[PDB]
Design a protein around this nucleic acid. Sequence first.
RNA 1: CCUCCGCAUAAGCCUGCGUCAGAUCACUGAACUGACAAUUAACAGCCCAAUAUCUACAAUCAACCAACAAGUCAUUAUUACCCUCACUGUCAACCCAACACAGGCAUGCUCAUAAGGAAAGGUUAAAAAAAGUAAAAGGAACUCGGCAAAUCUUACCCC
RNA 2: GCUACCUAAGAACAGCUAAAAGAGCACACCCGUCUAUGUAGCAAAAUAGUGGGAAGAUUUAUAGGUAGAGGCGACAAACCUA
RNA 3: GCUAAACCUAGCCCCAAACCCACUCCACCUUACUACCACAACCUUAGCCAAACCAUUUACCCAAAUAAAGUAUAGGCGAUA
Lengths: 123, 45, 139, 26, 206, 176, 202, 97, 41
Amino acid sequence: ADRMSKWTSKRGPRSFRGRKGRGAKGIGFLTSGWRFVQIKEMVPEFVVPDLTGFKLKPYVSYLAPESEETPLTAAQLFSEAVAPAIEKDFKDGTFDPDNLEKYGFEPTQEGKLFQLYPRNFLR
Amino acid sequence: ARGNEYQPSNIKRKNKHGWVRRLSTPAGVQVILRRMLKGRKSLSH
Amino acid sequence: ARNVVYPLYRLGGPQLRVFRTNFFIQLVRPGVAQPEDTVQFRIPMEMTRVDLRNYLEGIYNVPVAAVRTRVQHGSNKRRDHRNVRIKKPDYKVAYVQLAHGQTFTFPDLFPLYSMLEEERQQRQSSDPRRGGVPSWFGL
Amino acid sequence: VKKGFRAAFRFQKELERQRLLRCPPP
Amino acid sequence: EKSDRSIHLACTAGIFDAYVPPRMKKTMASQVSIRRIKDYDANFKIKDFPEKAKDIFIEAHLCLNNSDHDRLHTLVTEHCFPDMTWDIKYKTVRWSFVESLEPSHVVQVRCSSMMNQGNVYGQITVRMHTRQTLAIYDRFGRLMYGQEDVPKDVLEYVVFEKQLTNPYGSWRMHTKIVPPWAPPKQPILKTVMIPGPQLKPEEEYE
Amino acid sequence: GLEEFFDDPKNWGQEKVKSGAAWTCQQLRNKSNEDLHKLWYVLLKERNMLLTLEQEAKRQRLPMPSPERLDKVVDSMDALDKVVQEREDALRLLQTGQERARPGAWRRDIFGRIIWHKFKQWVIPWHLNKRYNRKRFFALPYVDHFLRLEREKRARIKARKENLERKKAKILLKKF
Amino acid sequence: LPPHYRYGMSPPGSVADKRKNPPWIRRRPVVVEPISDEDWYLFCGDTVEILEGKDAGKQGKVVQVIRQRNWVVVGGLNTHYRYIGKTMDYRGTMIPSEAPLLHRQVKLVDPMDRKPTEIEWRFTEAGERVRVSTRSGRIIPKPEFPRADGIVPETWIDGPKDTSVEDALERTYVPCLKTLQEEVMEAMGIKETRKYKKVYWY
Amino acid sequence: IGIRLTLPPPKVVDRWNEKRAMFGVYDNIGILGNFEKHPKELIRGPIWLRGWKGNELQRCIRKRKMVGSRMFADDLHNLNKRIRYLYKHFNRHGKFR
Amino acid sequence: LRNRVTDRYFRIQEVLKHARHFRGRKNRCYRLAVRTVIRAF
RNA sequence: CCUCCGCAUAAGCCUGCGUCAGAUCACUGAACUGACAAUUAACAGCCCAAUAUCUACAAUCAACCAACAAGUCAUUAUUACCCUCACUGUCAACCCAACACAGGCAUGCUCAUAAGGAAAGGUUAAAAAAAGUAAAAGGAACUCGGCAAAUCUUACCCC
RNA sequence: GCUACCUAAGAACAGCUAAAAGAGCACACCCGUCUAUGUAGCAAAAUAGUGGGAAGAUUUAUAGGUAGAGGCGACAAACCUA
RNA sequence: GCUAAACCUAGCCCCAAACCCACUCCACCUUACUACCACAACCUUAGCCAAACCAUUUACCCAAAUAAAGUAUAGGCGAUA
Ligand SMILES: [Mg+2]
Ligand SMILES: [Mg+2]
Ligand SMILES: [Mg+2]
Ligand SMILES: [Mg+2]
Ligand SMILES: [Mg+2]
Ligand SMILES: [Mg+2]
Ligand SMILES: [Mg+2]
Ligand SMILES: [Mg+2]
Ligand SMILES: [Mg+2]
Ligand SMILES: [Mg+2]
Ligand SMILES: [Mg+2]
Ligand SMILES: [Mg+2]
Ligand SMILES: [Mg+2]
Ligand SMILES: [Mg+2]
Ligand SMILES: [Mg+2]
Ligand SMILES: [Mg+2]
Ligand SMILES: [Mg+2]
Ligand SMILES: [Mg+2]
């Protein structure tokens, strides 16, 4: 006879308490006789770098001078990545409206391991 | 002796007055709609 | 990582990876007497014991042997001035048994005022021979 | 809190009379 | 709690160098201190000050008499005022000043040396020897100490403070020095009982 | 090791720890892509130390040495995440012209209100999905009257707000 | 904060403030004259003159500004006395304590003329927002005041966990149309050969 | 008890504010201005009330037909109910027939 | 509450004045006092 | 001195007599307030590739016998198939009866306990009232009626 | 989620006599004959004692169904949240 | 002398003007707020009440205020419309 409390896996009868969980992402499946099969590949792997000889530390010196905040946009990214290559190739006759893929553009995301839309990677 | 008419169970509570039971019929939909307009914090069990 | 949509897997897929992991850990002093190898942790809900194993041996290079978890229910008994229930949040508790017979014990963390002090000692209290007569006058 | 001034003024004058009864001036 | 606002002090408790009542070292200390007075104000005279110290003393005591705390505040430090007025509330004081015997003179002058930020204090000590009258009455107006209108002699040592840094700082009475060799204060009217140890059943008197 | 859940023993129970300023977004933008990834784990370990330290103070019923450190650390990582997010977002625009990473649609729930429905991933196509087909992404007619009442309600609240604004200005004119 | 919280002299998060304004209380709101953020001209460390109240017609230094109530606190001016440290038995010790003033109750001083003057905001090529006296063509500079944390940046020393300025401000980012994810993988030498299969999104 | 125990703040009425000073000016717009406008064109307020007077029942009838379409669902239900009430009151009740 | 009687205290005192010298509750309780005061007059 | 109760599971409830500090029929305290702790899976929940194809003969110590109401439990052929122990429940004096209610409440083990409990705030020994125990001689004389207590009967009539 | 009835898949019934049974005595259980207490009570129907059944048309846990111009009913105008 | 009493301002009402909000990450129609597998919507309002009963009948928003006009007309030719 309570409506206002949050509904949880603690709360039902036996069957109910089995079915619901907390938020944890499942990492396998079940087979006959309730045997759990784990898939190694479904388990997230921590991609953790080498920290040896690394100068950056978690806090910053106050002695550092202040600079104006300017966020990143597509326009300026194009200007400081693609634009110099394009204009340099515009000077000669190497540039082409077709096959501009040389500059880093891709027609499709289908083949890629890291597909941008829809996103297929974690963080 | 009377008064103990409520013999509680989670299964029965949910299958009778739950969100899914509510949406199942147009009548129930309107029940939810009413509670939303009144500003109830419990829309259903 | 938590509060992100995990990409689906089909057979023969690429190995799922995280690069920056939302999970944050506390290592906590147990309230009950434990084995020397066992260490306690407060853990995000969405974390698994598989995850915590990998987390510790990955980031901290801590070899672990065994991990067991449980979900601690916070009390909803407390009420405010408006007579509304205040929920203490539920958290997950992970016990980790170390390998190679390593032993860990929780460290012993935590081993104008002049004017105030000088006046406090200049109190002079009160002499019952005077019987409450003012003391300021030198007469 | 009742809008009006007359009843309030009357009451103050009543209180003045009571105060005079309690401790008459020299 | 850490916030930018600070508790602002207009006095210091205690005495920089306690004058001891009954030699060239004290005079040179006074000379360097008066120099450290002059550089701040440049209109200070050691000659004329005792009179100012005298009349300030009298008017402070007149304040006590009539219970005017505001004038007293302009006149007496924040260290002194509690000692002045903790007992005096809910009783009447009748203090008067009769003619002085020995003229008031300065005994020593000392200065602080930047113990706190934006705070320089200066303590000067004056010896005063005069006869006064005093009566303290009870809450019901029953004479409880002193006599009505007959003077008795008193020797007192008084310390004066000023804020040297502050432009609105003023010379105020700060404290009294009681000598160890001083005769005891004249006896009170009533008799008292001092209770002995209140013993728990499981105790014996020694 | 397990030891690095705690800071340097020399500064244990020191009441005050001198700590640096939180990283700015600008500073992090100058930093390399790979280097941000490395810095991010440096910030991770630091967070966990401070979180365990929070809890231990709470247990001993003692004040934390420098609690503000935690805030700084958090902010730095917020900043870092934002910086990285920006890079991904920028690149998406240049490559696909999609503003949102996850696909979705404007839909009409049964309560007749317009929602941004986020998609989920499935193995099978939608027409074959029994659970998905159970959902009603449309409003039958009976809902329209409620939509009216809802609107009217919103209007009332708004009207009330406006009035009070005006009234308040009036009294503020008589006093000044 | 609750709606119609009363701003005390205590900072809002303090224990003292919690004692004064608990969650349940609902006092009559204070009527304050709303003045624009640009038009506000009283800063901490400025010298002002007190016009009315006790201790009027005297210079003083601003120590605290509470913008919510249009309040200015002057250190050691407009003072009343309280005892601090009083217990069951002990009487405590007496200190002076400042009372706030409305911004009408003070005005700024001319730095040279040493007299109270009205002030107007001006735009200059040198200074975007500057302050000028109405009667005297004299500019009043912004007073020096320490930061919130009180770091004192002129004399500060790095700790063990503090990044050196040169290391922090070196630009190691070279723009590219790889993601963070692609970059780290290829740099760490971790390689995947299998192709990611296509999923229905709905 | 239920009587105030102090005098309320004195109320000062400015009889010579602009609104009081120019009260009732242009009430003679008609006779003095060639009959270009009726004075009833100085009336501001409800749509159904400008230069018209009636009892409650009549006022309700009028509000129903003039702003009936544009008013809120629950307000209109209240107004339809008012009219039903008043209709019975006036036609079926009272001292005199 | 467009119009509220503000001076009932004075209307009450008019009866109670006469009732002062009586015995029991009717010397102070208005709904009792009035009835006896009428009879008295 | 009492125990027809206990211990466990289920069902229901949701931190609801653990520790520490203040605080208030009974302690100036606790089943009050705040802060801190805790319940670790082997038990239990959470299952199963496809298309055909198979499946007459109870249970009852299943033996003899004996039935009637006719009964809880099975596959094979071919194809496809190689990774592992994840997730959730786990506390308490507890639930439904407005209550710390002589009421309600499923199964297993203990059938009297190895477990769990306390009828009496202190006194005095009036009346009337409730529940007992005993009673000379008599044995229904009581009463609408042997109601009740007893005792632990017989023959009928109406339906 | 009480109660009336049904549906699915369950569970309970000691001891003794019996030609062996909607049998007999009699626990647990289910019901409620008679008396007394209680009557703002322990209780919006209880308690103490005495009784009826207790291998069956028995009792009972879980889930589902039938809805008011109606359901359900070994008909009491019974029951369908005091 | 206790219990008390006293308060002005939160806000709200009716107008006018003007056509409104639908919203970081995650989750949410299965037992909602739960990552992850082969049916379908449109269908005369009735009644109280008035008629001093009741049985035909009994005003209810339809797109310009006023007037035409409670007129023509309808109606157990009556209530009334
Ligand atoms: Mg039941
Ligand atoms: Mg577990
Ligand atoms: Mg198992
Ligand atoms: Mg025992
Ligand atoms: Mg007892
Ligand atoms: Mg007794
Ligand atoms: Mg008797
Ligand atoms: Mg006998
Ligand atoms: Mg007889
Ligand atoms: Mg007889
Ligand atoms: Mg009998
Ligand atoms: Mg039956
Ligand atoms: Mg039988
Ligand atoms: Mg029998
Ligand atoms: Mg019959
Ligand atoms: Mg009958
Ligand atoms: Mg009729
Ligand atoms: Mg009638």
